[PDB]
């Protein structure tokens with residue numbers, strides 16, 4: 001029995017119309033054009049020779065407006081003249097002389113561990129694919145990004161408003177990815193330099209595991225549900241010892257508890273038992289806990305909320 | 306170590322600009338507007354009372370052009386006057402008096418089992434999500450579709466050309482989905498009626514399992530590779546007895562064999578052994594064979610081809 005769950009991304013058209021190519025000398029990557037501003041990773045200013053110890057303050061001072069070339073390729077082609085430049089953290093903010101006529105309603109936000117967002121992967125200012133990821137507890141994402149993908153953007157949508165939350169910067173040694181928020185801070189403790197970096201330990205996202213167990217119940221799969229219960233306080237002490245995030249309930253989780261009639265605390269107990277092993281059984285086709293689906297995913301895709 | 310594989314969909318903007326709402330009396334669903342034609346499922350003509358034994362020939366004759374209401378909501382709003390109507394298999398072909406000014410270059414094709422395509426899920430003519438699926442050997446897809454989703458479209462893209470291959474029609478008893486090709490035929494043996502239907506047995510897609518084992522090798526994971534080999538002929542005899550599709554090699558698979566230095570026949574042997582059990586080991590985070598990634602996915606996402 002198929003769960004009705006898929007990895008669902010937002011339709012990408014609104015964001016496709018904002019993607020541009022940014023070139024600075026021997027470097028090219030993607031940028032995001034909103035109003036009269038183009039955002040892109042600041043390492044577009046770095047010669048590949050110096051990526052391991054760049055002085056971005058000196059690189060920035062060495063640039064003029066004419067140092068940058070901004071091009072839109074798709075749909076409504078355009079070469080955009082740069083008329084100002086500035087650095088904010090790990091991003092450049094270029095000012096251009098034409099306002100994007102397809103600028104959507106938008107905000108900038110930071111995404112939290114366990115939360116999902118959509119990514120528009122782009123190369124040379126051309127969108128090539130879209131996928132959805134969850135921000136991991138160690139502030140990486142399990143993406144699919146190759147050389148040239150930097151400046152690809154991640155976002156959520158509330159109504160018609162696009163909430164931009166990620167601009168792609170780098171791949172870590174274990175194959176995961178990270179990037180910047182639009183305040184210019186890198187997610188986690190990462191730096192935008194080509195150097196070995198401590199990567200922090202990942203954890204299971206407890207709230208998303210709970211969501212997935214509710215999805216199982218909503219599909220008629222509830223063998224793992226018992227009367228037994230573990231309190232949030234007791235579960236969270238256990239989680240710190242067992243590489244789980246601490247559980248924080250939300251209204252979205254509460255809606256799943258009400259729909260199914262199964263208490264959160266019953267599923268916190270189930271998680272503790274299932275972590276020790278599924279004893280040969282499956283849940284929604286899986287022999288391991290799944291934490292890549294959020295309570296909101298389950299509410300939307302299964303309950304139509 | 307993350308594989309670098311995700312479920313990747315095409316950017317959806319080109320197709321978003323083709324989606325419309327079609328209403329016929331008490332029924333509303335989605336349609337696809339290309340040139341002066343709007344395609345939609347023919348059960349928009351059926352009153353919910355009669356969905357179990359409709360006479361679509363009589364329903365069609367009972368309609369006039371004014372029976373249909375076509376509306377575009379997003380981006381460039383419009384009410385489209387219907388000036389002709391026709392049935393092709395399980396689809397209606399409505400002719401409208403305005404050509405879609407955003408019609409992309411397009412073709413119609415039929416997708417084969419094991420092949421992947423992108424879906425734009427829509428409700429009331431409004432795109433709400435995108436995801437990618439593989440056509441299963443029993444001509445269903447493991448989608449995410451709720452009431453109102455019919456007329457949602459699936460497609461592939463070659464260059465700038467969109468190859469439309471699926472128009473959503475129904476959910477089966479096991480939670481999977483199926484629909485029509487744009488020649489109006491339903492995939493598989495399914496009919497567009499609200500009646501119990503024999504559903505055929507699914508199978509593992511052998512070529513995609515091979516692709517995934519190559520993805521594992523490309524990520525440094527090759528414990529399952531031995532000198533031992535099973536011929537395609539011998540594997541295909543085994544597959545018929547073990548709920549696997551017969552293996553048919555392609556140039557995309559050959560490219561993976563050349564890059565990795567591991568022969569297809571080595572992986573056909575591995576599959577036979579892994580099917581009997583992973584003996585407590587994991588491949589790319591999984592304790593079971595994965596068949597939802599195609600050779601083309603692996604070439605594109607990991608090898609950048």
Ligand SMILES: *[C@H](O)[C@H](C[C@@H]1CCNC1=O)NC(=O)[C@H](CC(C)C)NC(=O)OC[C@@H]1CCC(=O)N1CC1CCC(F)(F)CC1
Pocket residue numbers: 029043051145146147148149150151169170171172173174175177191192193194195196197
């Ligand atoms: C921008 O387009 C690009 C995107 C990368 C390329 C490959 N996949 C991506 O997501 N970003 C970079 O190349 C980035 C640039 C710096 C200045 C921020 N560098 C980067 O991602 O380098 C990661 C390297 C290459 C692959 C890999 O495993 N690592 C990390 C690893 C390098 C060796 C080590 F010893 F230093 C340990 C860390």
Ligand SMILES: *[C@H](O)[C@H](C[C@@H]1CCNC1=O)NC(=O)[C@H](CC(C)C)NC(=O)OC[C@@H]1CCC(=O)N1CC1CCC(F)(F)CC1
Pocket residue numbers: 334348356450451452453454455456474475476477478479480482496497498499500501502
């Ligand atoms: C069109 O918007 C809609 C899309 C469906 C709704 C739910 N999810 C979807 O993908 N299509 C239909 O409702 C479709 C209409 C007919 C005329 C083609 N009917 C349909 O999908 O019905 C499927 C039903 C409802 C859920 C379910 O399990 N089944 C199949 C099952 C019904 C009972 C049975 F005994 F007949 C055995 C088969």
